[PDB]
Design a protein around this ligand. Structure first.
Ligand SMILES: [Mg+2]
Length: 183
């Protein structure tokens, strides 16, 4: 008896709830995602995930009016993780300013936005997350901080062509930022 979904929120640990405009006229109220049709939920969430994967700052800003900054997908990713991995410091800052949990861990290894930024070699995003107050000591399921992950990826990166050489330079910048080195 859903007319439309008119809002989203996180609940508890890792759950989503939706604000429902009811067909029969009862005042809108919050229900767990499981109480209503999967297709109506999926169709409501789509523009959010599209905006995050496009690092579309304008669309994220508009959608935030009614939706939770920390909406999670099936794998426990929030928009912050998607835009951090893509290297969008503009969208990282937008979402942080909107109240995103900077320390959110996913369910595909327990990675944070800082692990995504370190692993995809996004030094400006690592800088931004540190500035904005991410807890750099948060560990993934393997017990690795973002700094330890960056060092691991550096050790597995060969030195053989100019693109690989450049990747190593970016990883070294990630490492220097997380170590708190003087620039
Ligand atoms: Mg350690």
């Amino acid at each position: 008896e859903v007319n439309k979904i008119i809002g989203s929120r996180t609940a508890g640990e890792g759950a989503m709830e939706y604000l429902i405009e009811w067909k029969d006229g009862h005042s809108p109220s919050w229900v767990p995602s499981s109480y209503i049709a999967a297709d109506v939920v999926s169709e409501y969430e789509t523009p959010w995930w599209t905006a995050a994967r496009k690092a579309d700052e304008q669309a994220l800003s508009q959608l935030l009016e009614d939706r939770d900054v920390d909406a999670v997908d099936e794998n426990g990713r929030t928009a912050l993780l998607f835009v951090a991995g893509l290297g969008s410091d503009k969208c990282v800052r937008l979402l942080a300013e909107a109240g995103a949990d900077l320390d959110h861990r996913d369910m595909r290894g327990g990675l944070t936005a800082l692990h995504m930024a370190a692993g995809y070699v996004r030094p400006e995003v690592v800088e931004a997350l540190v500035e904005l107050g991410a807890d750099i000591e948060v560990e993934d399921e393997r017990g690795l901080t973002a700094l330890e992950l960056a060092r691991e990826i550096l050790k597995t990166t060969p030195k053989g062509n100019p693109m690989q050489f450049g990747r190593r330079i970016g990883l070294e910048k990630v490492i220097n930022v997380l170590e708190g080195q003087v620039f």
